[PDB]
Amino acid sequence: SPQPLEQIKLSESQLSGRVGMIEMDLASGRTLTAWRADERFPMMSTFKVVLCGAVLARVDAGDEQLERKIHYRQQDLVDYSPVSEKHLADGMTVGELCAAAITMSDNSAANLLLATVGGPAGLTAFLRQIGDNVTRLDRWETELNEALPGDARDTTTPASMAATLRKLLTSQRLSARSQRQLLQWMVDDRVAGPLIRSVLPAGWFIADKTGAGERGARGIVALLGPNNKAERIVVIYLRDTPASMAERNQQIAGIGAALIEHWQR
Ligand SMILES: OC[C@H]1O[C@H](O[C@H]2[C@H](O)[C@@H](O)[C@H](OCCCCCCC3CCCCC3)O[C@@H]2CO)[C@H](O)[C@@H](O)[C@@H]1O
Numbered sequence: 531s532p533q534p535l536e537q538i539k540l541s542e543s544q545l546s547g548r549v550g551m552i553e554m555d556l557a558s559g560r561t562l563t564a565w566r567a568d569e570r571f572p573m574m575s576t577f578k579v580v581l582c583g584a585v586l587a588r589v590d591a592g593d594e595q596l597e598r599k600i601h602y603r604q605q606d607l608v609d610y611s612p613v614s615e616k617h618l619a620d621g622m623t624v625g626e627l628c629a630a631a632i633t634m635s636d637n638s639a640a641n642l643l644l645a646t647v648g649g650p651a652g653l654t655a656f657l658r659q660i661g662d663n664v665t666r667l668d669r670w671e672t673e674l675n676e677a678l679p680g681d682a683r684d685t686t687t688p689a690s691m692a693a694t695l696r697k698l699l700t701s702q703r704l705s706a707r708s709q710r711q712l713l714q715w716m717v718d719d720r721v722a723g724p725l726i727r728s729v730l731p732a733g734w735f736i737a738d739k740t741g742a743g744e745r746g747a748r749g750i751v752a753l754l755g756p757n758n759k760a761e762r763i764v765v766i767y768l769r770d771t772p773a774s775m776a777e778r779n780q781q782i783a784g785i786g787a788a789l790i791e792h793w794q795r
């Protein structure tokens with residue numbers, strides 16, 4: 531592979547799309563690689579990590595319990611509810627809902643959680659409270675990943691998302707247990723985690739949430755590092771490419787390969 535920046539550029543050439551990318555030390559926030567890092571990209575399902583950060587902030591404040599069982603109706607369900615459609619009779623706990631949203635990208639679970647934090651407006655206000663003045667959620671599942679050209683709704687920037695993830699995982703805004711829980715949900719991703727492990731060299735840690743949307747939108751927020759450590763946050767978003775899902779996956783994996791081959795920077 532070429533250097534990470536060379537590879538990011540190649541990916542834009544080969545996709546005819548914009549790529550946005552931050553590589554950041556998790557412990558310190560040192561920015562290593564930044565490409566279009568202040569440009570907007572649709573969050574798509576990556577917003578689910580931020581969502582559960584807001585849920586955990588409520589748990590810490592004593593305003594929520596991960597144990598609390600939520601009962602819901604079939605008419606409440608939206609497209610893509612692999613876990614939540616199985617629990618119409620018995621409900622799901624708030625913690626189960628976050629696990630389903632993050633690890634399975636269950637959309638009804640995400641909407642159920644979104645209501646508890648005050649909807650898109652409430653989650654945006656939470657972002658503002660933790661010092662993210664850029665990221666915004668405007669819509670519910672499943673309309674939020676429409677990715678219309680020039681539309682600022684439901685967007686983040688690579689720099690904002692990486693900073694926000696670092697705040698939630700490491701900054702003591704969340705309690706120790708909550709930080710540990712958010713991390714474990716990302717480790718437990720079933721959508722992309724096992725697939726990424728299968729192509730990663732032995733010794734590399736991965737935790738992640740992925741997203742996809744219209745007009746080629748694609749993304750991943752991840753923790754990655756050698757020696758089985760979550761050394762760096764890596765945020766990659768793609769937009770406005772007509773490429774197949776497979777090619778968008780391969781290009782993101784290519785940026786990953788470049789990082790792996792040239793890790794010491
Ligand atoms: O010399 C470094 C390594 O080079 C190769 O590893 C390859 C691997 O065989 C391939 O499957 C992967 O593809 C990249 C897969 C990355 C998966 C997604 C990455 C995510 C992670 C975080 C967010 C951004 C994208 O590249 C590496 C580096 O060339 C060798 O196979 C391996 O033995 C060696 O240790």
Ligand SMILES: *C(=O)CCN[C@@H](C(=O)O)[C@](C)(COC(=O)CCCCC(=O)O)S(=O)O
Nearest residue numbers: 574575576609610635672675721740741742
């Ligand atoms: C989040 O990014 C959801 C993206 N797409 C879903 C949507 O609600 O629009 C749908 C329902 C597909 O969802 C999945 O296949 C579950 C994984 C989503 C994340 C990923 O692909 O990595 S729609 O068909 O686009």
